[PDB]
Amino acid sequence: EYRNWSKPQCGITGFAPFSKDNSIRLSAGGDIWVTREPYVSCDPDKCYQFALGQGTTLNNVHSNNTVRDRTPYRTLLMNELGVPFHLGTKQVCIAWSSSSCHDGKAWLHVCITGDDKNATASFIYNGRLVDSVVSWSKDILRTQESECVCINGTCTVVMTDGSASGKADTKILFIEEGKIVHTSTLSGSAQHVEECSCYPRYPGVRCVCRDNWKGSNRPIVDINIKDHSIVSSYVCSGLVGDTPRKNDSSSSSHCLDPNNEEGGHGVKGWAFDDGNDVWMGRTINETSRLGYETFKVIEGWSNPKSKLQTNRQVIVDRGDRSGYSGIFSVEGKSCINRCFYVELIRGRKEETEVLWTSNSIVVFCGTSGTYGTGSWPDGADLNLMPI
Amino acid sequence: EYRNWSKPQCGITGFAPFSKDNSIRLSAGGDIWVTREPYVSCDPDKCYQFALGQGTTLNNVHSNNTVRDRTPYRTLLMNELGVPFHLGTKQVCIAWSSSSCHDGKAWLHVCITGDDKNATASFIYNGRLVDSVVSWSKDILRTQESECVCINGTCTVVMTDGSASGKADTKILFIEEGKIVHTSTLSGSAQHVEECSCYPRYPGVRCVCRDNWKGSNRPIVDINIKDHSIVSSYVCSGLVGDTPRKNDSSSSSHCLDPNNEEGGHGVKGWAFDDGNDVWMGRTINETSRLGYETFKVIEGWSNPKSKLQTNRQVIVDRGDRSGYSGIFSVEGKSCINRCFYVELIRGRKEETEVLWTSNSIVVFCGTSGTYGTGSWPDGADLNLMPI
Amino acid sequence: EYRNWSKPQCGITGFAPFSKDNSIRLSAGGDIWVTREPYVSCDPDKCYQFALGQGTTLNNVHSNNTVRDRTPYRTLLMNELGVPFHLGTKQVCIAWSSSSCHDGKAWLHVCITGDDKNATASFIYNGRLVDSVVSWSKDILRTQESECVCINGTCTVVMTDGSASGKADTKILFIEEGKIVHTSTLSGSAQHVEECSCYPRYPGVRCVCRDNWKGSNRPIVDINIKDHSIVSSYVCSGLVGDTPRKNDSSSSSHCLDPNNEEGGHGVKGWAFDDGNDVWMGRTINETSRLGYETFKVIEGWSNPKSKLQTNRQVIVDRGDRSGYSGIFSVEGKSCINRCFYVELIRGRKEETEVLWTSNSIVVFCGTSGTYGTGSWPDGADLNLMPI
Amino acid sequence: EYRNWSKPQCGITGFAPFSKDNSIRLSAGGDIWVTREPYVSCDPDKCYQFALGQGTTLNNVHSNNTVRDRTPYRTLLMNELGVPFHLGTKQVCIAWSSSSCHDGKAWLHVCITGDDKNATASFIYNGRLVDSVVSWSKDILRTQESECVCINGTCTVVMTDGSASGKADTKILFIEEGKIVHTSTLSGSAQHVEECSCYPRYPGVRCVCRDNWKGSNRPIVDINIKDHSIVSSYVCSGLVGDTPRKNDSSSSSHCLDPNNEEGGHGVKGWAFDDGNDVWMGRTINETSRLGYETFKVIEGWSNPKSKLQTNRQVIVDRGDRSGYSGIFSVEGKSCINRCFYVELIRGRKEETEVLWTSNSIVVFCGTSGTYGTGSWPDGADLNLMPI
Amino acid sequence: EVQLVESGGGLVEPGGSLRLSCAASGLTFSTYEMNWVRQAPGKGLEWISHISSSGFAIYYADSVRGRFTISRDIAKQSLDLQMNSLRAEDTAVYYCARDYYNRDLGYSGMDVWGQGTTVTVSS
Amino acid sequence: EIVLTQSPGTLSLSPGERATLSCRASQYISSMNLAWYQQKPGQAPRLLISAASSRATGIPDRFSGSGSGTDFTLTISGLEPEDFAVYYCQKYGSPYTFGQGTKVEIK
Ligand SMILES: *[C@@H]1O[C@H](CO)[C@@H](O[C@@H]2O[C@H](CO)[C@@H](O[C@@H]3O[C@H](CO[C@H]4O[C@H](CO[C@H]5O[C@H](CO)[C@@H](O)[C@H](O)[C@@H]5O)[C@@H](O)[C@H](O[C@H]5O[C@H](CO)[C@@H](O)[C@H](O)[C@@H]5O)[C@@H]4O)[C@@H](O)[C@H](O[C@H]4O[C@H](CO)[C@@H](O)[C@H](O)[C@@H]4O[C@H]4O[C@H](CO)[C@@H](O)[C@H](O)[C@@H]4O)[C@@H]3O)[C@H](O)[C@H]2NC(C)=O)[C@H](O)[C@H]1NC(C)=O
Ligand SMILES: *[C@@H]1O[C@H](CO)[C@@H](O[C@@H]2O[C@H](CO)[C@@H](O[C@@H]3O[C@H](CO[C@H]4O[C@H](CO[C@H]5O[C@H](CO)[C@@H](O)[C@H](O)[C@@H]5O)[C@@H](O)[C@H](O[C@H]5O[C@H](CO)[C@@H](O)[C@H](O)[C@@H]5O)[C@@H]4O)[C@@H](O)[C@H](O[C@H]4O[C@H](CO)[C@@H](O)[C@H](O)[C@@H]4O[C@H]4O[C@H](CO)[C@@H](O)[C@H](O)[C@@H]4O)[C@@H]3O)[C@H](O)[C@H]2NC(C)=O)[C@H](O)[C@H]1NC(C)=O
Ligand SMILES: *[C@@H]1O[C@H](CO)[C@@H](O[C@@H]2O[C@H](CO)[C@@H](O)[C@H](O)[C@H]2NC(C)=O)[C@H](O)[C@H]1NC(C)=O
Ligand SMILES: *[C@@H]1O[C@H](CO)[C@@H](O)[C@H](O)[C@H]1NC(C)=O
Ligand SMILES: *[C@@H]1O[C@H](CO)[C@@H](O)[C@H](O)[C@H]1NC(C)=O
Ligand SMILES: *[C@@H]1O[C@H](CO)[C@@H](O)[C@H](O)[C@H]1NC(C)=O
Ligand SMILES: [Ca+2]
Ligand SMILES: [Ca+2]
Ligand SMILES: [Ca+2]
Ligand SMILES: [Ca+2]
Incomplete structure (x- = not known):
């Protein structure tokens, strides 16, 4: 019943289209939640999409000024991959930060809400509030914003608390059926760690995070689930x-x-390793979140000074808007497949013809077959949508 | 197997955020039921929210003047905890008063409707109308407006009938699979008993009620399900x-x-006991329903003249409307947890910039871990909402 | 697995409120199907409501002139009892006449559609189109507009074909898993038989129909499942x-x-028998369908010239609109309970401040306990409702 | 668990009405997806409708200019047969071409999207992205637009790539649990084979396709599900x-x-064989897609020069709009039944009073009983529908 | 009002070079296949070049093949045509145009055309 | 070279009548790839017909082209002052090819 992710990693030559929600296009006529910071996670049967909704729908007077990230009204929304966040969406916790696991038996939700200075993290397992933690650094407590990983029932969540642009404390929490059984302080060479994309690299968890302080490379956190020992480095x-x-x-x-x-x-982004090579994805732009491309760097997980791409794909065109992206693993018949999602942000803080901010999602999965080219933007026309 | 509630009570140091529905904020854009008097109850798998809907949505012509509590159109609405009362909500009985149990096998609904003097209470179990009762005092027959409690298949429902301010006849009904097997008249020191929040204090049920006639302390009704024994006192x-x-x-x-x-x-409000101490919740204002705070009074369940709080929390702030609140118990892995819900009322009852009255719900559960501070109001802006 | 209705009939002293849909009140704000001719039927778990929808919602341009009863667009809509006919409603067949059974294994739908003269009746069982019949009298083929009854898998459907004002052919069809195994022509003293409300009076089915030729009393059709024998008389x-x-x-x-x-x-109406007495329901007005009352006539199933009511109830007030009503039986723990539904019609049939015609439903079930008084109209205000 | 369609073919004398969605009529009031190219497929329990949605609803600013067939926003929508494509519809893949199977265990979706020249076909089985293929002819890769057929776990999909006015490579792909186990190039007398309607003619699959170069008769592709040998001819x-x-x-x-x-x-259309006779359906108008009739040609599967029609039916009236139609088979109790669906197209490119293009569906199934006459158009009035 | 607009044509001596630019808003170079088609003064329209939707597959007419290149640069979502080794036969009114081919309907047609750019190659 | 000959050199007709223009292909061309444009001298060619029978948006239902096999025809129910222009066939493919040009004149 529990899920161990014991199988090898699937052979990946690229990624194939898997899903698209068209949230903003449907919001022009319909009742769709104003969301942001989405992700995807799968129970052993199918896959679900999660988001942090601002407590309102796009065509709602309350959609005004929704560029803020920490309000008492943001909740965690969960639908089934593909179903847009309509008004029948179940919102599963109060959270302006979130993460979610499935250990093979029940869903685990980590939900952070509260005042920025003093904040609370609720751990909800199988529809019960099993545990709760307070800020240790008395700052903005925050978590992965993507899926967490469970191996042998023990799930792992990376939570940061501290300076936005300074030294911050990061902990790895080991949860068993919603109860926090252990907590390891981060140790290693990674100085700033935030918004980690974790995947089960059996026998452990490997997370590729963002450095918000002094780096343009991504940190790596290697969690060994059995001995709770943490290692840190950079991509x-x-x-x-x-x-x-x-x-x-x-x-x-x-x-x-x-x-x-x-x-x-x-x-927030992702990367994983295929032998010595690294499969990674990033925005085509280097100063704005415009476009999204994935590729493979040869000997990129072991050798710096390597700039030899291969198998490049353009998931979102260079002229179109992207945002947070992340990884999630799917158990196949004989191996473990890696998929990623891209968040396509539309609205205020950049496009000043609307008063709201929301996102759509586009999901790709790795493939051992062949694939073509394309581009799957959001597609919404904000010049005609209601302000 | 039936819910026997045999486990001990969980160690509670406070309450952590669990759910929020954002009903009024979503009602500005979208079709959401006009409700009031909500509560929460859980089957052994997940939790459900119930409300008494006025037979209309909020962006509706019929939403005008919905401050009345007894109309032929109010029904009992049930969703999963988190799903807002959209137009797909199943309304499970005709009721302007209601209560709901789950005995581990099927749901029990007690629904009161009918003319004010001569009113009927239908007892619905497993989707059948199993029983029915008439007013005994030929007055406004009314019930808990929150969950009832079953132990070994025998639920208990507290029903009052009589004057609003004055002596009234209160009975405790013992129901088995929807059939009323016994009825005990109330006996003890509690004079007026209404809108009780009951919880399984194994081997019996303990209810904390409201005194709507001559007290600002709350009554206590100790029902023993096994021997039909009722005791009354005050908090x-x-x-x-x-x-x-x-x-x-x-x-x-x-x-x-x-x-x-x-x-x-x-x-309507709640309280329960931790040894000699009392865990309780109330509004911040003493002459209105503004704000909501919970705390612990030391030796408050055994000693009057004790005013020693501890572990105070501010669930809703002192300038933000609150309303009915209640308790519900959740069976954990090794103990029984206590959660509460607060109803956040917004409408022409007190405000006068809208013609309707509705509510939103915020749900907290007890925790043995740590927690922070916060405030989770309704958040609706009625100056802009529909007209 | 099959359903045989073998238990006795429950002791009935009256009927208690069971359900209300508030369709017209919700239609003012929100997208609700335009329906008419509803009924209720229950599988061994819960109960479902059915209706014949005109292929449009109420706040729709196509809602105009929906007083017609035979269009190519009417379909059969099915929800759980309580859920209003929103846009997520599954429409289960093309039909401008319909009936529905549940034999304990799967649902059976009889759906009549097509040209008035040459019409087609499709018999759908377990999601397959199992059988089909053509008009025998080359006239408006029509059926019960309420639930049919299955005993030992063999379900029975009463279908009439021929002139309403005049002699017409009526047949009883015996269906097994959607396949028509037998067809008995009607024989007895009932001359005109239409829109029958049938119930399992084990070991057979008893139907109380309407007579559209000179009459005023209701016909009775006694079918015997074992021998396909048919007896006819009048109430x-x-x-x-x-x-x-x-x-x-x-x-x-x-x-x-x-x-x-x-x-x-x-x-269309109902009646059943309690010993020699008859439990019946009818409209309060006698020259229009306004109001609805149920009562018991003593020795009314065996003796004409008996006008001795008892246990009268006013389900819908005499100044409010009603319509088709019907019976359905629910298997209890130790006996078989009888429930009825009333259709509250609102529209340009008779009220000309709107261009549409629709209905709401109110459902009551028999009780062995006590009950009060009340009145549960539709409640819609058409002077304000959407043009 | 697997499905081998081993039973004989049901005796068919005609087709009876089975379903209607009324999509365009409901789109006037309510939020309904803009779709086209629909089909129907059934798992062993019930039947589902699929469509290719343009990523928007009809009362939407994005609904303009939806006559194009290849956009980055079209996805594959799946509901139960009967439920209209409301905003809660699950969209199961990114696709501007699609096909779907159920092998008795899980659903298989073939989804083609991407650049016209370089395109990608994703094969999704049981909620996983199992396989992927690229264009072989570097042209518009396209598939059946209706259901595919699985026998003993091996499913078969016909995919064409190339120009009509040019050399078109058609292949038959044999898929096992989402993985492509074999690929056979088309061979036989059929030059062009587009948009095939396939059905299990045990022990193999028989597909009736469309010819777009030099043909008004339909091609036939006989796939041996076992030897993977392909035969081609014409109807x-x-x-x-x-x-x-x-x-x-x-x-x-x-x-x-x-x-x-x-x-x-x-x-796109369908046809199948009853002995030597052919059951077929086509538009009543010979040049435009107006009307739809089905009939039986005697010795039409084994004799050109046969023009003996029989058992003619008029599913859609000759002056009403139709479109793509297709076949799907339903496993009965003792034989295999054949059903068809007709797509009723409404909007721009043929009715210039609206800016959108959408479709409704009407579904019929074969019957061994009798049937009448009728006509079931879409019914939408586009002169009033909202602009 | 505004649509596909082409510019950059001028008098050049024979044997020279030129670059022609069509830029468009909404009638994007992202969604449609683009085509350059010219017309000699008082002659029939002659299609010269075709660029696919992704700007990868390129076809040229026999007359201009090997001296002309139709290419696209992201700048303002626009497409250009570089002409080198021009001749006196290339005097024309060059046009940019957009097309689509439906898999179920067939050629959409060059629904939207530019205004036209006049080129006179002479000494 | 699939040379589309537009057969009428000029319809040369009097106003307010039917005008039937022709278009003959060298080899059997599928009717899908064919379109008809109106070039009024001095302006861009305006699309009239696509897929040899399908009308263009904003174009009145007066223009109704048809044809098949190797030959196609464009029929105008009534000529009006604007209709007087050159009309071109065009065929999708590698390469595209236009027609020589069919004019319609007054009187
Ligand atoms: C971050 O989040 C946390 C939540 O996780 C926030 O912490 C919570 O903060 C609130 C607000 O301060 C606390 O509630 C308050 O508790 C006090 C009682 O507790 C104090 O006094 C205890 C009594 O001790 C006396 O005697 C001993 C010797 O015996 C002396 O040493 C003491 O100094 C005292 O004289 C004391 O024992 C407590 O300390 C212990 O317990 C706490 C909690 O368990 C632990 O944290 C400590 O480590 C230690 O173990 C503590 O010192 C209540 O009195 C407060 O109620 C009053 O204040 C309200 C304010 O509006 C008011 O409405 C009430 O009416 C009430 O009023 C009091 O003051 C009035 C002044 O005029 C008097 O008129 C009135 O009569 C009354 O006296 C309140 O309940 C929570 O306990 C605390 N919860 C935790 C930590 O779990 C934290 O604030 C957040 N931090 C940030 C950054 O914001
Ligand atoms: C609170 O809720 C409850 C539940 O809803 C309500 O109770 C229900 O109320 C209705 C309306 O009152 C009752 O139905 C009515 O029943 C009477 C018949 O029953 C009466 O007469 C019986 C026969 O009496 C004979 O014998 C006595 C002597 O013994 C003689 O004096 C008589 O003349 C007769 O010969 C009698 O047996 C009944 O007694 C029962 O009830 C009493 C308590 O009331 C008990 O003590 C007894 O033990 C026993 O249980 C009873 O007295 C019908 O006649 C009524 O129908 C008529 O009245 C309607 C209103 O006028 C009218 O619309 C109908 O047309 C009908 O018309 C009658 O009068 C006409 C002239 O107007 C005649 O032309 C016509 O022919 C006919 O005679 C009605 O059916 C329900 O039974 C009762 N239900 C229950 C369970 O109690 C209660 O009202 C609510 N209270 C409040 C505060 O709102
Ligand atoms: C990115 O490339 C740009 C363009 O060349 C760089 O800008 C110049 O960088 C060189 C050093 O490599 C400086 O000498 C020039 O002064 C810079 N500006 C000018 C005027 O060209 C830019 O610095 C590069 N960024 C890096 C370092 O990645
Ligand atoms: C309640 O039921 C559980 C499961 O059978 C049992 O273990 C427990 O002892 C019961 N408690 C009591 C006191 O009935
Ligand atoms: C298909 O499977 C069924 C059940 O196993 C079997 O009876 C049938 O003969 C099989 N079909 C054939 C002919 O292989
Ligand atoms: C299907 O399976 C049966 C065995 O159950 C086998 O005999 C038959 O050949 C199979 N048919 C094919 C070729 O799919
Ligand atoms: Ca950085
Ligand atoms: Ca009081
Ligand atoms: Ca009559
Ligand atoms: Ca053809």
């Missing part, structure tokens, strides 16, 4: 994936330390 | 929980009788 | 149930033949 | 089923080769 490839980042001609990585290049802010 | 803590109530410095209780202080009304 | 009570009817001071019956009193038209 | 009946076609007085087939008569631009 070693010379083609770094955070945005803002420097030109491909002049970008660098350290494989241990932040590169100290255009590391002021960042975006 | 003994010096910090009384009803509203209207007197200021903390000048409040009293009697542990047997009404306190006679601002007892000319009340609000 | 013997002196208080006749059809509308139009005489007054109540000077009306009679014949217990074998039509009484020839104000028999020009009729209303 | 031999003298009454050809494509449109544009000749006038029956002047028509002809070749039973091996295209007839070279008004062969320019076909319409």
